[PDB]
Amino acid sequence: SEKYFVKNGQPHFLISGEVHYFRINPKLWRNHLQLLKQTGADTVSTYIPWDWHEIEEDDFDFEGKTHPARNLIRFIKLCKEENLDLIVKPGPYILAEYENQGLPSWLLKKLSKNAFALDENGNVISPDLVSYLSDEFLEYTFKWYDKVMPIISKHQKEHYGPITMMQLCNEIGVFQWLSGKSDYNPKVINLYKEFIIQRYKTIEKLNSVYSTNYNSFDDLKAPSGKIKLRSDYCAYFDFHLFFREYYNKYISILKNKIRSFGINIKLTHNIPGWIYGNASELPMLISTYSEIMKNHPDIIFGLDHIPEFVSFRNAHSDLACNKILEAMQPEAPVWAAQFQAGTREHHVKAYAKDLETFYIASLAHGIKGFNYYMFSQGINPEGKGFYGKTFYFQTALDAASNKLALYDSIKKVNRFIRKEQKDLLRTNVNSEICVGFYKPYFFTELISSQLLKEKKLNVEELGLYIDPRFLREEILFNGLLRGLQTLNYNYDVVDLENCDLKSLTAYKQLWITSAEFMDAETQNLLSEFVLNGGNLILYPAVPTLDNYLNRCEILKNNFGIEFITKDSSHKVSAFGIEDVFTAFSKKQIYNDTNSKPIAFTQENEICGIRKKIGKGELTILGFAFGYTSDEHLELIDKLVKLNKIKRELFVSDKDIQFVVRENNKSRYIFFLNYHNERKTFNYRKSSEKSEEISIAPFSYKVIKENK
Amino acid sequence: SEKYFVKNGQPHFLISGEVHYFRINPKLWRNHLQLLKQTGADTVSTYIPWDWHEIEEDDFDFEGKTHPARNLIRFIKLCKEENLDLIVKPGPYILAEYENQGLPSWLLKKLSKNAFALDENGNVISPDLVSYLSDEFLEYTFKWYDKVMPIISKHQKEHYGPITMMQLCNEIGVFQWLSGKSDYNPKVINLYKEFIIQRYKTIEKLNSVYSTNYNSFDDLKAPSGKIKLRSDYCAYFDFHLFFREYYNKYISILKNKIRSFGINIKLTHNIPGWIYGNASELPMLISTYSEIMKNHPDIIFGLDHIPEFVSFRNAHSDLACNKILEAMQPEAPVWAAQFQAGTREHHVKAYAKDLETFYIASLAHGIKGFNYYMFSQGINPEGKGFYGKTFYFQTALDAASNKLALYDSIKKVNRFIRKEQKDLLRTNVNSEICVGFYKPYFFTELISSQLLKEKKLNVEELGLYIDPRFLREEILFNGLLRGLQTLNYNYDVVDLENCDLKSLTAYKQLWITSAEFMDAETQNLLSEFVLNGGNLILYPAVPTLDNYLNRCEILKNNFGIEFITKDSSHKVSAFGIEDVFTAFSKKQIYNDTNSKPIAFTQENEICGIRKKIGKGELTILGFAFGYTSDEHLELIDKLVKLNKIKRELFVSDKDIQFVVRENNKSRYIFFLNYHNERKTFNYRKSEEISIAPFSYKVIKENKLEH
Numbered sequence A: 001s002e003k004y005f006v007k008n009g010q011p012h013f014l015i016s017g018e019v020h021y022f023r024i025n026p027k028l029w030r031n032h033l034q035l036l037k038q039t040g041a042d043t044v045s046t047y048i049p050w051d052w053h054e055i056e057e058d059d060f061d062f063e064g065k066t067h068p069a070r071n072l073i074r075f076i077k078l079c080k081e082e083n084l085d086l087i088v089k090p091g092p093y094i095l096a097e098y099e100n101q102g103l104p105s106w107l108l109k110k111l112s113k114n115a116f117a118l119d120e121n122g123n124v125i126s127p128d129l130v131s132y133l134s135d136e137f138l139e140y141t142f143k144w145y146d147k148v149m150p151i152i153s154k155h156q157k158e159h160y161g162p163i164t165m166m167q168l169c170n171e172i173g174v175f176q177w178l179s180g181k182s183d184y185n186p187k188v189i190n191l192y193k194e195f196i197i198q199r200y201k202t203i204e205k206l207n208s209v210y211s212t213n214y215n216s217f218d219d220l221k222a223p224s225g226k227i228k229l230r231s232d233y234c235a236y237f238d239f240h241l242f243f244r245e246y247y248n249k250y251i252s253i254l255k256n257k258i259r260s261f262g263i264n265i266k267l268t269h270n271i272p273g274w275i276y277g278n279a280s281e282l283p284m285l286i287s288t289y290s291e292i293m294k295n296h297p298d299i300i301f302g303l304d305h306i307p308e309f310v311s312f313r314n315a316h317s318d319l320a321c322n323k324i325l326e327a328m329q330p331e332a333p334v335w336a337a338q339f340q341a342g343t344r345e346h347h348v349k350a351y352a353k354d355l356e357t358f359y360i361a362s363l364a365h366g367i368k369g370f371n372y373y374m375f376s377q378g379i380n381p382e383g384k385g386f387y388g389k390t391f392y393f394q395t396a397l398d399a400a401s402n403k404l405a406l407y408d409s410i411k412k413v414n415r416f417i418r419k420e421q422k423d424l425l426r427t428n429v430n431s432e433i434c435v436g437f438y439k440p441y442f443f444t445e446l447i448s449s450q451l452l453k454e455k456k457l458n459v460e461e462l463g464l465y466i467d468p469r470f471l472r473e474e475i476l477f478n479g480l481l482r483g484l485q486t487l488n489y490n491y492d493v494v495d496l497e498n499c500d501l502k503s504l505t506a507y508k509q510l511w512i513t514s515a516e517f518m519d520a521e522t523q524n525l526l527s528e529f530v531l532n533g534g535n536l537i538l539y540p541a542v543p544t545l546d547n548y549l550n551r552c553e554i555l556k557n558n559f560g561i562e563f564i565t566k567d568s569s570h571k572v573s574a575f576g577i578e579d580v581f582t583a584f585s586k587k588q589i590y591n592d593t594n595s596k597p598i599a600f601t602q603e604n605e606i607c608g609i610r611k612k613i614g615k616g617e618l619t620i621l622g623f624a625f626g627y628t629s630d631e632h633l634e635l636i637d638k639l640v641k642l643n644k645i646k647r648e649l650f651v652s653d654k655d656i657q658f659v660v661r662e663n664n665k666s667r668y669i670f671f672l673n674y675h676n677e678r679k680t681f682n683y684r685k686s687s688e689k690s691e692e693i694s695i696a697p698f699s700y701k702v703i704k705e706n707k
Numbered sequence B: 001s002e003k004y005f006v007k008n009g010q011p012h013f014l015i016s017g018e019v020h021y022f023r024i025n026p027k028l029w030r031n032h033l034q035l036l037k038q039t040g041a042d043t044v045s046t047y048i049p050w051d052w053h054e055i056e057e058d059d060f061d062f063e064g065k066t067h068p069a070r071n072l073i074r075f076i077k078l079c080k081e082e083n084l085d086l087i088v089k090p091g092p093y094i095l096a097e098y099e100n101q102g103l104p105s106w107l108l109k110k111l112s113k114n115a116f117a118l119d120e121n122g123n124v125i126s127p128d129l130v131s132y133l134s135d136e137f138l139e140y141t142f143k144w145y146d147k148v149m150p151i152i153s154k155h156q157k158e159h160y161g162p163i164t165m166m167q168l169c170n171e172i173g174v175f176q177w178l179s180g181k182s183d184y185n186p187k188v189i190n191l192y193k194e195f196i197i198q199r200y201k202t203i204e205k206l207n208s209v210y211s212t213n214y215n216s217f218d219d220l221k222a223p224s225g226k227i228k229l230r231s232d233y234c235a236y237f238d239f240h241l242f243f244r245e246y247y248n249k250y251i252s253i254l255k256n257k258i259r260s261f262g263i264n265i266k267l268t269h270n271i272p273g274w275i276y277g278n279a280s281e282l283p284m285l286i287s288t289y290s291e292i293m294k295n296h297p298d299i300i301f302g303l304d305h306i307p308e309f310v311s312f313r314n315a316h317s318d319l320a321c322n323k324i325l326e327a328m329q330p331e332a333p334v335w336a337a338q339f340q341a342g343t344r345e346h347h348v349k350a351y352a353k354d355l356e357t358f359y360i361a362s363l364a365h366g367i368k369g370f371n372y373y374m375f376s377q378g379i380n381p382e383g384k385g386f387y388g389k390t391f392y393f394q395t396a397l398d399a400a401s402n403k404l405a406l407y408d409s410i411k412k413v414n415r416f417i418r419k420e421q422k423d424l425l426r427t428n429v430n431s432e433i434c435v436g437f438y439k440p441y442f443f444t445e446l447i448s449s450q451l452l453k454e455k456k457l458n459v460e461e462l463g464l465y466i467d468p469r470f471l472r473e474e475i476l477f478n479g480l481l482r483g484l485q486t487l488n489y490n491y492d493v494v495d496l497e498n499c500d501l502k503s504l505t506a507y508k509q510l511w512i513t514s515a516e517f518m519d520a521e522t523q524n525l526l527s528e529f530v531l532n533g534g535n536l537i538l539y540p541a542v543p544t545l546d547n548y549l550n551r552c553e554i555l556k557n558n559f560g561i562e563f564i565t566k567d568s569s570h571k572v573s574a575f576g577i578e579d580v581f582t583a584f585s586k587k588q589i590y591n592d593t594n595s596k597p598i599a600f601t602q603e604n605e606i607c608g609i610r611k612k613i614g615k616g617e618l619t620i621l622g623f624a625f626g627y628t629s630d631e632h633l634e635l636i637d638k639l640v641k642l643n644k645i646k647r648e649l650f651v652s653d654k655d656i657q658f659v660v661r662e663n664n665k666s667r668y669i670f671f672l673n674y675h676n677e678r679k680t681f682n683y684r685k686s687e688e689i690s691i692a693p694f695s696y697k698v699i700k701e702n703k704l705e706h
């Protein structure tokens, strides 16, 4: 059952608003807090910028002695007086469109070149981009923590202060992503060499996996440049594995330091990945936290949602992100550390009537808490803005604390949440579909991404044809997940790593989007799933290689599949649907042994089959489709109906999205119109005269039923 | 002064709908045409696919002998019976999501390897991609023309047929754009060599310009791979010039063959470039047609507008494109050969209420005619779709001629246009701002584009810091042009090539977005402009190089400018605006003798000046800004107000966009709400109105005689 925040042994919907004390006239701090409280928010959230408080090396001001807005201590006391809990975020990085991402100018001037993140040629990637594990960086970070952490410790909830949560640093790795370049600092390269020796033990074992001919570990260099050989792909794959251990070591060092101050509050981190109003790359960024989330059950990750608009063009991003966070972090609530309010960019408008729908859609899509970012506009003091004087536009409050149009939208959404939170937080959706999350397909931020400058991964040079980024973006994120949401079929996402078979068994169908490679553990898990009675849908490929592109045919043999890869027209027929456009000329052509052929190439060769195996069912399609045609939705619909899965409602307009959330007491129907059309429609429960609804463009309705 | 289509000696708003007979049940051809006519549309437009009609080599069906939807003759007859003019588009390429882009399968099977576009290794780029000047391709094209062109000729309006216009081929060069790959067919490379020999005359002259080390023209190889040296940049620059001449040679061969059949109707071509609902790349595609537009005053280019949605996210794209086409094609009306109706992509919705506002915005932004693409949905016959069974979604009519939501929107907009066309077509905007179009910055489709994944141009490798695509997309298209439209300042665009000094004197300001390179002819033109009394705004660089990156400091010397390039904070102050975020660390720091400093680095070095030169005024900014902050709109506004330029209206809500269009007698005020907010505002000349989200209002004002 559901994960949710709890206050006083009852479900609590975390409603926070971001208010930057350092960007607001301190004579107006109280008015901002009062107006936030009056929306029904229970929490306020702020960065504590290292640059703002360590005004010169070893010169600290938290009391407003050198600038009134340096009076952190007073802001904390005002939070307590106005009955708001406080989330504090002291960095060292805050980003936050603050000069030098929040690092002091004096620090970046003073640090040696080996404090910085370095490219393949030894050059500084960016004058504000440190190497996370630089000894110099960590020494200064610790001296900053020595001053700000005693203040945070004294003002924690357990000492009757307002502070309930603290974020460690900010969006770890967001610059290795954005800058479009990875850190070849020698501290990093030496840690990588240690990681490889620990992983492989002998150069002979490494040479056997990579198919390389090194005489010693001293001959192994950090991979750089384009992947041309499978041995380059192997080296980069382990480099990805290493960076996940690297970020875990960084956050582990910050956490150990923080705990030494008697800070026992909840620790948080925040997930980047939205850009241009979609989040198809966020799954790659959350995959960079795989080792933190396994090692730190006490650090809760939240999402940084930046939709910019709310339409069918991005409707699927927030649900797919909320589902993937749940998959990687199943023991904590799904929540947004930064939940768009106003816009960071003047030229990229944020309409109250878009964001209001986003807020309701987020509830439909399972969000359990959020921090409106930004609730309050700021004015950068003293030239501190990265890109201009004003921080955010079209917020709930302007910097002067005037109510703007979003204020009433947030009050309306908060009112509904506070009325309903006791039941709403306990509601589930009935998912009969599970979609597999295979993390290794996402481990490409060094070699293949939307932000990366040079494409380093070209699978055709490795004798492959299914690119893992193309598969996870277009076949999974924009394809299957977009398709299921559009068709109003509930799905859950499961992390396949150390996945318990007992968790998969509750679903009517398990859907796996597969490349030509998949590890032995996952091939074995899916084999057992089907033999024991599971129903598996697998496309576009039966894998035949492992994560190092060495032979592994476990699943192919356990399923009694024979296939050859042949070129044909992109168009196939599947389940009687003609002219299904597929992504590749190459297809898997299956022997029809003990199977029903259900998809055919233009030469009528078999490119999909259905089989019974043990107590289970297998459907394999040897071709790739996402959602770029109507035939693709017809095909997803056909596949779902193979196990007689039904939608919760009959709705007369197929372009209306709904979510039914229920517990024992209560049912919530969320209707979402992601289209620029006033829609009049009727619906009824699949279970047992119809109700008529009119919905405005880009709008929502919520119906509560008492059961 | 305005350019517009004419019918019966009066202004005529060309309203066409695209209806693909080859994709529609012939029993329903008359129904589609009657419903199109009933919207007030006057013209219908279609491809005539070569693959569809030459069913096997030298076997032609135009009469539905082998499939009823091959009855082209009957469709043409129906157009006439239903009182519609017809636009025909017989290729040879049609694209149109048709298998093999409209070329016959039997042709692609039969052609020799030397008929195909080849990569630098001599490998076929794509089995459906021919070399445009292949002898074998033009031979088979001519044999297609020998059968379809006598039918088109017989059905011209001249012979009380319906045919009024014909498109030659389709988006010439589009495949080099989409792939980032040039045709290295030896026949193309031979024509390139001839182009280079013709241009430079001797290997010594080419070596002096390129700084190459060739002993003869025999050493010369077509450029390929990344640009590492200034000499590679030179070679690639001329390779782009060559492709513009090559496309002109191709369309000239088609044109002359067409004219040989007594076809005297108006000839057209079409311009692509919209990507994900914005058009910042479309100017690059306009630039590929520079030589066609110079040499064929009688071929009318129309735009392929694909906005997908209508909001502030893309509001500036259509105006910037319409203005640039006007600059390049001043003697023809700006029109949309493909004007979005429905969506090519099922997952990319096209809402009737969005497109209705796009159609009215298009009128505000000077469009004189359009062809709804697609008015009618199609079903691909017997697997001949590139993609699935269906061609377009959310159209005016489905393939079965069912009316869809867009139908009533088109009928409403068409009623307005017909009511107003006689006056509306003769209106212009009063532009006091002129923005220079310098085509060489756009000549990059083989080395730097939004569609080219692996960038071949990296200007830092050449000792430069201002990339021409960054300049033209972010500083010009999404920056200055977006800013002026947002601020409701009218602008015009002028082609700086062979530009008449007398045309520039009409304007109060000329804005030049300059890289470190600019040819001598443009440097001299801008020198004379200011010296004779013009007011020039120039940023982010005084250029010091020509198009071949050789020294050329004519403008710098004529204006008494001296500068050092120095690194500083991205933020500057300009005209007392603090914290103006600029694109580059590197800025020009100007000597201020005989000058007024008006912009400063964080350390107070002078990165902008104003000065008097002869009778005119110069404003130089040594930094790059587009529109990514409110300070950028503040800076554009202050720059415009240096020469006392005023908006036509005071409108109380700054986020309402307006366009005042007038002639001697008539004024139209177009109000455009690109925002998801009901807005109430008032207006007066330099009075109270409510506009729905993503909507519009048009007010008419009669002008009083004096």
Ligand SMILES: OC[C@H]1O[C@@H](O[C@@H]2[C@@H](O)[C@H](O)[C@@H](CO)O[C@H]2O)[C@H](O)[C@@H](O)[C@@H]1O
Residues within 6 Å of the ligand: A095, A096, A097, A098, A101, A171, A174, A178, A271, A272, A273, A274, A275, A276, A304, A306, A386
């Ligand atoms: O949309 C891409 C990502 O953008 C980040 O915003 C950064 C901002 O944090 C930073 O202060 C400025 C200046 O360096 O650059 C922006 O691009 C967001 O934090 C991410 O959530 C987002 O995915």
Ligand SMILES: [Ca+2]
Residues within 6 Å of the ligand: A059, A060
């Ligand atoms: Ca001090």
Ligand SMILES: [Ca+2]
Residues within 6 Å of the ligand: B211, B212, B213
């Ligand atoms: Ca030389």
Ligand SMILES: [Ca+2]
Residues within 6 Å of the ligand: B366, B428, B429
């Ligand atoms: Ca005009």
Ligand SMILES: [Ca+2]
Residues within 6 Å of the ligand: B560, B561, B562, B591, B593
């Ligand atoms: Ca001077």
